[PDB]
Point group: D3
Chain length 133, copies 6
Amino acid sequence: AGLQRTLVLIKPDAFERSLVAEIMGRIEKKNFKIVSMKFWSKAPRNLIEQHYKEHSEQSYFNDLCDFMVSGPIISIVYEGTDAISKIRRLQGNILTPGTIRGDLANDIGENLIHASDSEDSAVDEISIWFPET
Amino acid sequence: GLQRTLVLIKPDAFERSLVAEIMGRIEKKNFKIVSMKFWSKAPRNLIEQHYKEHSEQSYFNDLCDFMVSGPIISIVYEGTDAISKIRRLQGNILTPGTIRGDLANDIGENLIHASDSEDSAVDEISIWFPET
Amino acid sequence: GLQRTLVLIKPDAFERSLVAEIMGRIEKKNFKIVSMKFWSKAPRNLIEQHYKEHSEQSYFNDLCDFMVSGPIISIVYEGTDAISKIRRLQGNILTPGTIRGDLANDIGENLIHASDSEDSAVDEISIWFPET
Amino acid sequence: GLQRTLVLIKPDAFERSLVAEIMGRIEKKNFKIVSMKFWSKAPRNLIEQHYKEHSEQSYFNDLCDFMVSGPIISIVYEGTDAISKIRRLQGNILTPGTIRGDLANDIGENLIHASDSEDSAVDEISIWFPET
Amino acid sequence: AGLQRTLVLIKPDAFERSLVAEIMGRIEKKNFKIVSMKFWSKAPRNLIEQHYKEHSEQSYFNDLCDFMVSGPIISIVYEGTDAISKIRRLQGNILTPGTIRGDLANDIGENLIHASDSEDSAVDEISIWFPET
Amino acid sequence: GLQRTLVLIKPDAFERSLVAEIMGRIEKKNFKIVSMKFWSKAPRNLIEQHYKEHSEQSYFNDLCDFMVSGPIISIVYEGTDAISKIRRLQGNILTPGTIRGDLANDIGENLIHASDSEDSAVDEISIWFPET
Ligand SMILES: O=c1ccn([C@@H]2O[C@H](COP(=O)(O)OP(=O)(O)O)[C@@H](O)[C@H]2O)c(=O)[nH]1
Ligand SMILES: O=c1ccn([C@@H]2O[C@H](COP(=O)(O)OP(=O)(O)O)[C@@H](O)[C@H]2O)c(=O)[nH]1
Ligand SMILES: O=c1ccn([C@@H]2O[C@H](COP(=O)(O)OP(=O)(O)O)[C@@H](O)[C@H]2O)c(=O)[nH]1
Ligand SMILES: O=c1ccn([C@@H]2O[C@H](COP(=O)(O)OP(=O)(O)O)[C@@H](O)[C@H]2O)c(=O)[nH]1
Ligand SMILES: O=c1ccn([C@@H]2O[C@H](COP(=O)(O)OP(=O)(O)O)[C@@H](O)[C@H]2O)c(=O)[nH]1
Ligand SMILES: O=c1ccn([C@@H]2O[C@H](COP(=O)(O)OP(=O)(O)O)[C@@H](O)[C@H]2O)c(=O)[nH]1
Ligand SMILES: [Mg+2]
Ligand SMILES: [Mg+2]
Ligand SMILES: [Mg+2]
Ligand SMILES: [Mg+2]
Ligand SMILES: [Mg+2]
Ligand SMILES: [Mg+2]
């Protein structure tokens, strides 16, 4: 088809705010399927630093990593037609109502969800979170 | 600015149990059902008239088969600026906040039809609700 | 244990825009619409047959007027143990978790009717859906 | 950083029972109620103050009659970028995903007011919450 | 009719958990109307002690008052047919799914909502929260 | 005090897209995920262990074939009185307001498993989360 896989992280603010099912349900309602999933009570800093390696020289890098290890996270591989960009549009941004971030988040850092933004980041990010490839 | 527009609820909505969810978004925008029909299986002729504008397109035949692969509801909706507003509500599979935007992920299986103009609306209402 | 049961969506559901909300609770319990009619105003005769068991009660006449005071939907639902299950879903205005339980607050205006037995179900389905 | 902004829940929200729905959307985006008042009927001079930039418009008197036709809630909300984010949440009747986009369908009866700027905010908050 | 008024408090755990609209909406959907409402960023301890005067000799009294002043609360007079008992049944308990407490709360103390439990408590509680009678 | 309990989301939840709905209800009651695994297909000996008190029943093989017919999620949840409260949330197909009451309508395909006692809990958690 146009069948793809993408990588989603549920960030610690989602657990803190009890928005976990709310976020996953929006992705579920658009007809995407869980293909693999892991729950991390605390994620290894090395996994986070890899995941956000492209950001390693930004001002926010260290606080980002701190936050990403500050509570649980769930990593999920989703599957569906055009999954990468469709789930990316679902994530949206804090300025755009209708999307997960648009409806539920209000901060440039604590923003509930990561979604892969291209085939390249998807393959690489899936590799990081699910090395059992 | 009162208008009537024709909506179809497609078989995939029944398959996935999204019927109420879809009608609900239209209800909450304050549009009123003016008439409504349930079809366990729509007559093929009705579907062919409905998508006649499309009889030449490559997807036509698959499209008719899918429209007949399960139940559909035909609904006449009324309200201010209804045609254009229900069209926006329907949206597309790309932009969230809408019916397709939130619930659909296929170019074919996309849950809902809404008339896109005054002419199509009159025509489509007469196909499904010929007693006018 | 497959059964069919008759549901009415009452005018107050239209007044309060709870139509989709009500059909949704039944849809999510996995029952299937088998046939469905929308009435902008139900024929008084139909309402009188429907509530005939009640023609002697003091509330009868007010009840008929209310049933005719706006739109109703007549729905035939199918599924395992449908009659009894949709009855429980309907509930009463006292116990939350149900349709009336959650959404209604009147002994008269209570949003939904559901057949309460095998006999009433056959009878009511034949009143509203006589083409069987 | 943090801002505060003034929201009014308009009389159409009470009538259509959308009060919790509208407040809920603002609540789920993580804004906090700092101040809130319920007015079964808001005093007309308050409404006229609130809408004073509108005093020369043709809809001015009609808007004010509407705003006084049922209850309103005035709320001061606080959170990061509150003025602008709550404005976007309010949206408009052409923009699905927003409060007005999903729930409203009229130029005038559109459920919610939100301050549109730092200055209108500070002003509107002093109108409804002059204690401070 | 059978038209009554009752008094509802939204407790500080509701604000803390962002359940305020969720709780009010359940009461709204059952067709009850707000007749008066006040938001308290912090409620006067004397109001709480009065409100819970019948409990003044229970073990839990002091922690209850502490909690009731630990964050915002909203006091609301609701109106509707049989409002006192119907809104009481809506409140329910932490053991009963379908109700506010049944669905949303899990603690004998932090339980999101108070509703008046009789005509007597209603009149008295309304008096406490809305002396402007 | 705190307890932990084992929940399984059964294959019918995945098929009917109710996974987030079921988890959401447990989430809104303030229980926390301590451990969680997704099994695209659970190994049959795990399922047979899990249901070993059922090994002599007539439905045993059919239950296990079902449990293996699609994905399951196993979750350890934590909160006050978790075992018993989550059991009540699960409810049954006759009890509106619960997960099975609102969403399920079959004796066997009923969406969710929840440990029913301190002992079955500790046992079921060691079956699905033997690391500990
Ligand atoms: O100023 C910033 C920019 C981003 N981030 C975090 O780093 C992630 C990656 O940043 P990006 O701008 O690419 O956001 P995204 O791709 O996730 O939309 C974001 O999700 C934020 O959580 C941050 O903490 N501060
Ligand atoms: O490549 C396509 C495009 C169209 N459709 C179907 O044909 C309908 C009408 O096509 P159109 O482009 O007008 O879609 P719409 O106006 O409904 O967005 C769509 O809703 C689809 O269900 C399809 O099956 N394949
Ligand atoms: O005092 C009453 C009792 C009944 N009803 C109406 O009559 C219907 C049928 O009465 P019944 O007692 O059988 O109610 P149901 O079986 O639907 O719960 C109810 O749904 C109400 O709408 C009424 O108007 N007043
Ligand atoms: O033709 C109009 C224009 C506006 N309004 C009302 O006046 C308010 C202020 O007008 P404005 O165009 O500034 O709307 P807003 O800024 O709230 O989007 C609107 O929200 C409407 O409720 C109206 O009743 N008729
Ligand atoms: O052991 C207890 C009993 C009750 N309460 C609090 O005191 C209120 C009144 O107690 P009651 O048993 O009457 O509960 P309610 O009437 O509110 O259902 C409750 O809502 C709880 O918040 C408490 O903190 N500990
Ligand atoms: O006749 C039956 C009885 C039970 N079960 C399945 O076996 C599980 C365990 O049975 P039990 O009666 O203990 O159900 P539970 O304790 O989960 O409510 C149920 O949840 C069903 O999924 C079944 O398939 N057929
Ligand atoms: Mg990025
Ligand atoms: Mg078109
Ligand atoms: Mg009866
Ligand atoms: Mg403006
Ligand atoms: Mg008590
Ligand atoms: Mg058991």
